[PDB]
């Protein structure tokens, strides 16, 4: 049970870190008036990024 709890805490921390990284990546992915941001997604590739 101790090992399971430690693993659960690790998974939760990893999920939180991933969410914070996604927020940080979406920070330049705001409107940034061009209605076109292919290149930030192509370079960073944080997740669900540039189709091309």
């Amino acid at each position: 049970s101790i090992c399971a709890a430690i693993a659960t805490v690790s998974v939760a921390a990893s999920t939180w870190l991933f969410c914070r990284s996604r927020v940080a990546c979406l920070t330049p992915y705001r409107l940034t008036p061009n209605a076109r941001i292919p290149f930030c997604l192509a370079v960073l590739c944080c997740a669900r990024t540039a189709r091309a």
Partner: protein
Amino acid sequence: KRQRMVMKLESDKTFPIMLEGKINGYACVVGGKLFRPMHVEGKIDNDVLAALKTKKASKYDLEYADVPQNMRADTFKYTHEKPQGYYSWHHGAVQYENGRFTVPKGVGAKGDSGRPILDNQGRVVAIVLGGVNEGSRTALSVVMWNEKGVTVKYTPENCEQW
């Protein structure tokens, strides 16, 4: 010039953010999608635009939403050419120097958030979000975009939400 700037801002669909009958800010459409300062509460003064669901961006205290293409027909034109000099906006001129925008003291206050900054060609170069007392002038906290498409927010130390 200021007359033409106001005429261009009015002809282009721009709508203040009304809350309980009070103008608490302004919002505009640039590049065919609506943007709104997140710290300003209320709804856009346009029922059709109000139907659009916005997304939040805490880092810059700004919101954005998709605008229908038919309404994307006539929006603000953005440019990345931002040389030093003077630009024009709703409350007169703005001085651009050292990468910062500054205006004379007494210009700008709480409720002016959202006013864009226009060049001599009427193209948007920055969006005014706040400011801070700077003696004989005041320095505005603005967001600008380089030719590479990087969003950069310049915020003076201890800047007030105007």
